[PDB]
Amino acid sequence: KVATVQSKMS
Amino acid sequence: KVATVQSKMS
Amino acid sequence: SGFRKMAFPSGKVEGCMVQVTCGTTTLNGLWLDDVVYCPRAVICTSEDMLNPNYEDLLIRKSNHNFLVQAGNVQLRVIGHSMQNCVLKLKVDTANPKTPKYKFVRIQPGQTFSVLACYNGSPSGVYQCAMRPNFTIKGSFLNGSCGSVGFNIDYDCVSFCYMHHMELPTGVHAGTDLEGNFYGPFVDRQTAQAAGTDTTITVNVLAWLYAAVINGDRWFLNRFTTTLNDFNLVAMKYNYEPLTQDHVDILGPLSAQTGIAVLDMCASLKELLQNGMNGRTILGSALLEDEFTPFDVVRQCSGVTFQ
Amino acid sequence: SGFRKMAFPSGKVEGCMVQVTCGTTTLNGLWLDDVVYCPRAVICTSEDMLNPNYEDLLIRKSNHNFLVQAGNVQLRVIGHSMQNCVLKLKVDTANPKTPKYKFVRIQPGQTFSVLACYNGSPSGVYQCAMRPNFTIKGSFLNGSCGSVGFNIDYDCVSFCYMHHMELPTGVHAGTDLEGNFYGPFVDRQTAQAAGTDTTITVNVLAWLYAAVINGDRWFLNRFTTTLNDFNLVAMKYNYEPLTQDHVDILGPLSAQTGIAVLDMCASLKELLQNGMNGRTILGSALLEDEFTPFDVVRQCSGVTFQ
Prior knowledge:
The complex is a heterotetramer, with two copies of chain A and two copies of chain C. Chain A is mainly β.
């Protein structure tokens, strides 16, 4: 598993 | 012990 | 991910908090439109407190006996009346910061945010549940009387609690915003005690679903149970009996995780009988009952991390 | 009486939250005076995220590539620059709601309030500690990036955290407000892991004092200990070593309760060795380490209930 940059990307 | 009415009384 | 005791953003309520002084007694008030709501205890001195005829004390007061301070500004009281255990002080200025609001009375087992206040100045915010015995396990000091509890839906503040008093056990009692107490309590300094409390079963189950949504399944089992068989265990451990309506309210969480409600009940049965064996759930070593199903859904991902 | 995880009132920060959109990526920004601060990740798409040359992506952007929305109003970006992992977007309107503020970097073991936000709209507030491994155990979903953590002293907001990312273990990492990460983390979607964590010893002791101030002494004992002998137990249980400065910071709480710090350390030694034996402290079944001595003093009575 990999870190998540918690923006909202489309 | 007795209930406390938690105003600030002087 | 993560699960925290989360309060609502308090700014809409901060804009409404004022200080109310009558004589040498001071406390907090809630200023909405041109009315300030506050506990009627503001008209009492320390000696009045054993046997207050709140009525008898109020007729001896005028409008100018009430000093209302909003920040740096004194508001002029132009009318006053008592409604149950609150006072309504009509002032000459409508609060420009008045949010859309409702006065709601909540049920035991529901949750709300508390804005603790002193001298009309907000000091902290925390999340509370109304206990089944109509007390709340708050954190309040002298001067807190008149701090309010609330929920926010969209941009409407539903006020549900005004703080009045602390019971001998250190728990807290108050009223709705029409001045009617939650539970069998009265605003005088006398020997009062809350009824025996119980654990809010539907809330514990909701919290167990939250834990699974956050990727944790250690407490699960392959057993199931009937509603009636679970409630026989619940009664042994001072848990509230579970209803079909509670099972229905848990439906959405059950569908998101794929764990039938009665299956989760069997997991709770095992936890009550065996304890936790040194393990934790969402960072707690006991079963948490101050999150509602709504609280879980609001905060957790809509997708479960399988 | 009572002891709760209490956050600061969030209204001063609510007035500063905005939405920042660049292309198909959106997140939260902090609008102070005529500058909007936000995570530089806003200029990245999903494919950019493994190997982002944030630099390379920024030179290909103009001011008009940044849409800033404050409620119902679009703010015009008139200048942009990158400072470490944050962007500073100069806008043509100064925020009339700008509080007195500071940009502060906190130490591991300190606490702060988090205003969780989505699409520039605040959604919840909760209290956090910076873990010794520079992570925080928050509650954050996609869209939360750019939510801020803060403390309030008098009427000054000391911003200390801007949220960026969630690590594989479900804990969270971010930067101070000059864009410098807390801990060895970077704003790209890669396999990163936090160092091994420890328990914040001085905080646990502060919380034990809080419990005594709230009338609870069951864990106390008649033993004492040297600082060095306690730290030999602490190291066995993955607790931080206690310093004389920590003992000094605990002084005021020690004087209020009449329990010497090293006496409380002996009580903690016993709790670590024996567990709790089915009992609780301030409503928890484990030792709580996310309250600082300052947090205890701020919330508890100045008088101990003897």
